[model samples]
Target chain A: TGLCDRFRGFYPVVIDVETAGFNAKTDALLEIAAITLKMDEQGWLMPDTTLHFHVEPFVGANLQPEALAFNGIDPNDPDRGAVSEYEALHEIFKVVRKGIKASGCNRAIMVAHNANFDHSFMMAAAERASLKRNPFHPFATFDTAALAGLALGQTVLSKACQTAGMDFDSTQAHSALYDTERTAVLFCEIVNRWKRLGGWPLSAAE
Target chain B: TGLCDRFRGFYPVVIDVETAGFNAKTDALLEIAAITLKMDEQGWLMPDTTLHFHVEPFVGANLQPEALAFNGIDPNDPDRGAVSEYEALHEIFKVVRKGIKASGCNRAIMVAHNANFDHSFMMAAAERASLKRNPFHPFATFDTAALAGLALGQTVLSKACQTAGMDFDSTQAHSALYDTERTAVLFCEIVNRWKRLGGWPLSAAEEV
Candidate 1:
């Protein structure tokens, strides 16, 4: 059985971000969270260290009122605990790099619900912050929407979670940390199922 | 009606790769091709140049019999015209970088059918060869299957092209260059239609 070991030793960092808007270039990044996955011999290991951050929008960053309302974030509220954009990125990349070294892997891959959206914003922010040690594969990610669409026949995050019989608190949906945790669970379930099934193109490849 | 201009001035590099197997890590990257898109005032610009490459599989790379059968490629054939993997990626990235510079955009986004598959393989190959300057957005791609699934109710490349009244030849379907060209035409058609009907959550974003 020649199962692809492409991701065998690597770790997946499940990422979710709540933002000021959909436009990656023009919008502000408000919140960020990621939960890393490690594989045990039995398959699927969850790491305890989940990184979360509340980022202050860059000075002169475009803050779409509608977007801020949608995420239920009040940038002006005093207790928001927001750090500068550079600080947020520095911490996130620092944690991911630490995870890679501890896991003995070459690099970490970003796993997200709608990966392109998160990745797009992350890359734009990285460029803005002038970060160098991103620690993620430059052009690849594990998108749960794509995986769920294939496995559970749903692409919406809440719907996909429900279809997989996983607990998803829709009330907590838009919070980056909450969304990141749920996505991590779903990714683990799907990957473990694939491992159990074994072989590419299914057993037919055998 | 404030439509986003996020994609303005950006070019899409339609990419397609043929591989010796499905497993990106172990498989041989057999071929690569891409065509760049430029937009004029009316939207949708076709470039005069398209890049293509036949890469020699890395030494000891796995070659799945089923995949080789599907592509109808014989790596050992004298006529295969395979270059080193490094040489292939160097040439490919060189052209994409040139496209980005000429288009006056920050970076080119890759466009493909079921883009994650193509991107996964490409990233793996790049990692193995240690080549930098990919000249594409790190994790963003314009996937035609997602676009076609939303717009034309089709996901298979050939089926989507047929549904959209675009040309697709099944005989040439798996060849990297042939597939790349067809995907590019389909992308142009879909994107232009979205521009014709302006709105937030344009059918274009839905497709991506």
Candidate 2:
């Protein structure tokens, strides 16, 4: 399957967001990571560049101690080099726009572990920043969690990775960058391996 | 594949909502239609009972003319049998909870054309009604739009339905029940066809 036809003009950009809480409308996005995909010469989907950002909590953003303990994000650490929400989104969205234009796709879609969670957090953050345009689809997301459960009999990120025979570390599990990278590779492998196993139209091509 | 194993123990409940506007945070849910899925004795996913409600617009609800024109929802029509927001949601969520218990699944996932849109509107409305429980997952949705795009080359509901060899009436495209029914069949068509094309552990089972 060609990259453009793979998802009906929607480019799947793998993303993972670390948030301060479960409420999308109330939580703070502390960290974000994205990885773009490309179609190699053999029509295999492959993960490409990575975009990672540390974002400052918005004013009046809700921070739950329970959530902070799980994600382990220090909202005020100078060592984190956290930028404002606007600054991080601007940089990240710029790259996404360029990728969409270059790939001849209409829009980008968030391909994440729990997809809608990341998409909602991203949209909520973008709304707080008053973004001009959201690069990814507002509602449609490509969830690796669903794909992994169907293909590998696992849903949790760490378990899905290990079941797929990929290395995973629980210590590094919640870091947006590590999680995003692992999910990116997993997405590509699921699609690529599906084609090899005669799962879609491309199965005939092989 | 068994229904529960098909999507990681998450039961897919097909839903479509007629709304007042595009902004989920501000819009009103005018109509809601839900079709639960069940695995038959043959292990095939099938559409089950349908619960539909016409809702009265909430207090201070924003209604855009453009949206109302598109969906053709007359929120204030007394003949429409519109119920209070709380009434509609209570009835809908009750059925969902019972389905979850009967299926022995954790919770239901919204399976819709643009899933997160329905989920967001559902949540926003639920928030307003102070619902005691939301039977659907908070942030996980099964967007048939994405599934159709992946399995078929079409994403739009009308086109995807027709392409999948299901009848689609453009005249009835925006109503909650009609769209929900079409989307329900489209979903079953897509997943069952994927099984035919060799998907998941089921394909490995055939080899063994």
Candidate 3:
């Protein structure tokens, strides 16, 4: 009863973020953010669907030489237009927040491939902007990596996805938007099983 | 140099959940949480300590039969003290928020033994209260276990503590205040050596 209640409703926002490097203050955020919406009764993202963004870089903020060679984004040229890290985050937050607010749910749980990393970089940028954290943040993080670990009994996402017979391209591990999109798809698979088994099946700390 | 001009501080508020068995919503939170703060100014724990509380429990929200037996708290006995999780968290937020305010730092980093676990519970509680995350939350969390891992090259806190020549308090690993106190002390020890080594060593997430 309660399990169904917890599962059936609300738009589950599948989201992702990319950054130039780990240091929040100095490192630039890269493009490619997407949110897969699993809408509830109001037709918001519930079980499967998505929203995503490609954040343009900021002025005088060149990509780290090492980072660029990896992700391969050309700041001088454009893809999803030009979005500063803050602007990209704002766009993501605005879309998700409004979608959640309009849906009349307190906040939808955020599922990420590696939630902590996304949260870390996002929190850094939010702190820089002096903004409050997004609706589902700090506490309500749902890591598909953790889910993968639970399922495969191992912590690595790529390995776990492969073990589950889930198709995923691990070749491009560092691309921000691509990674987010991959996680959203992966999360759907894991959560489906978790729901079927009646909750996470592991002890969630109070 | 900016590095020389910088100061480092850590306050990991350890928490223990006395739930009604293992159930989340129905079991609810009982009693309050306590963490003794050892604000290390200039690398020394100021002897004075702070106690944060909102002592009470949710009314009519009984603990599970099995869970009640474990903690030895009788929910039927109103005479015993217990506080709601919501209230307790607000009280906690006050201490943490103010501690950062007093320190003149915009935010404070939370240090805990196996931080991700505690953070999961604490943040959930904070969200239930509609409170802004306690000002102390940092983007990247420093795990004391990780520090101990890096230092002693082991995952266990006590093993690392003992190896580092720090006193080990085997008495109170699970209690909220005791764990925080131990961690705070351990944190001091960890940081001293960390600073002494110039700084914490970083590993690239992906090897070139």
Candidate 4:
């Protein structure tokens, strides 16, 4: 209880992505996106302000047949090519950089369910864009899924949700923006529960 | 918040016994015993009063040669001509019977770490004494080991203690009475932590 508050006074951006596959070089990020800032007490994403985009692939890599089918990507569709990958990324970085600055979070934590995967793709995309990533890249990030399993003795996201008694919202299962919000709520529940178990105090570093 | 009351009440007891061996018919309870009843806030046994006792075997049955050695019970000892099984049982039953009446409980909950083994001997003794066996026999028996495991999320006592970040006292662990006392303390700590997790007045049974 006598700890400095890291997550206390700031908003955090939870990011998630849906790509063609694991390979960043050969596999294009079919839909590279995320939900913008959600405040500490806000349980879900705010409407209108949420940032999301399905960027057009620049490298012209042929989609993996099964991956394209699974993700339901249609190249001939007009909406499929909203902006080039570079332009799309520039738009995303601009929003994140300016948004965190406006929120006054000198350092806000970036979180994702399995943060390593999202961070990897995001970093890869940043390199592709040839621009340094925004305000949050310097700060810490949290993997709610990892923390949930470690603390609650439940590893899988669905199982952890069951343990926490929070239902997995079916609607948010696939969309990066939607999943981000859901994972954020799930993370809050796990952290709160772990705090109770360990009697550990939350601080700025954490 | 309207419903306000301290309902933290429980009737906890610790029991330990030394049996000759595993077989119920072939083996008998060489030493049947227990300890002081866990009391409520009122200073009375939370539900009953009880203690542990050691019973000498009758007819030389349940005489585990190895067990006798382990407990240091020498066959050539002078007091080997101890009380009959019935007599030993009467002494133990009288304590439990009176304790059940004192608590106004129809049956006293039999408690031990792995109470199934204890219940087997207790039921046999009750039948021999012509007393109706406590129908809630299983309920009467609480396994502190299992309870401790559930609360701390670690099965064995040693591991559970380590997970809770509590020190382990490496005393006589297999001893029933000693285990009962230790498990009781560990279980209490777990329940307290679980309660704090829900922020009290649990809204749902599995509420995170």
Top candidate, metric TM-score: 2
Could you list the chain B TM-scores for each candidate?
Answer: 0.88, 0.94, 0.66, 0.65
lDDT for each residue of candidate 2 in A1-206, tens digit (9 for 90 to 100): 46777777888888999999988899889998888889876779888778899889899999999999998889988899898888888888888888888878889888887787888888888898998888888677777876675567567788888878899989888799999999998888777766776655634635
lDDT of 1 at B15: 88
RMSD of 1: 15.1
Cα TM-score per model: 0.53, 0.88, 0.46, 0.43
lDDT of 3 by residue, A128-151 (tens): 655555665443455565444333
- What is the per-residue lDDT of model 3 for residues B75-177, given as tens digits with 9 covering 90 to 100? 5566655566666777777776665555544544455555555555556556666777665564334456544532343346676567666677775543455
**What does candidate 4's lDDT look like per residue over A1-206, in tens digits?**
21112243233566777777666666677665655544243222232145677766657654676766666666458955556667766776677666666655544345666554666666676677786545454423455543443334343566667666777766556666666656666765644454544433312114
* lDDT per residue (tens digit) for residues B44-76 in model 4: 222233344445554546577887667655544
The fraction of reference interface contacts (C-alpha pairs within 8 A across chains A and B) present in each candidate is: 0.00, 0.43, 0.00, 0.01
RMSD, candidate 4, Å: 18.5
Q: Write the per-residue lDDT of candidate 1 for residues A1-206, one digit (tens) a residue.
A: 11112353345688899999978889999999878766555444455468888988877789999998888998888798988778877888888788677767677767887687898788888889999877876656666765564345355789878877898887899799999999988877765544443422223225
Question: How big is the positional error of residue B27 in model 4, measured in Å on the Cα after superposition?
Answer: 66
Instruction: Arrange candidates by TM-score, descending.
Output: 2, 1, 3, 4
Point out the higher-scoring one by lDDT: 1 or 2: 2
lDDT over C-alpha atoms for residue B3 of model 3: 14
TM-score (chain B) for candidate 3 is: 0.66
Kindly state the number of residue pairs that clash in model 4.
10
Q: Which scores higher on lDDT, 3 or 4?
A: 4
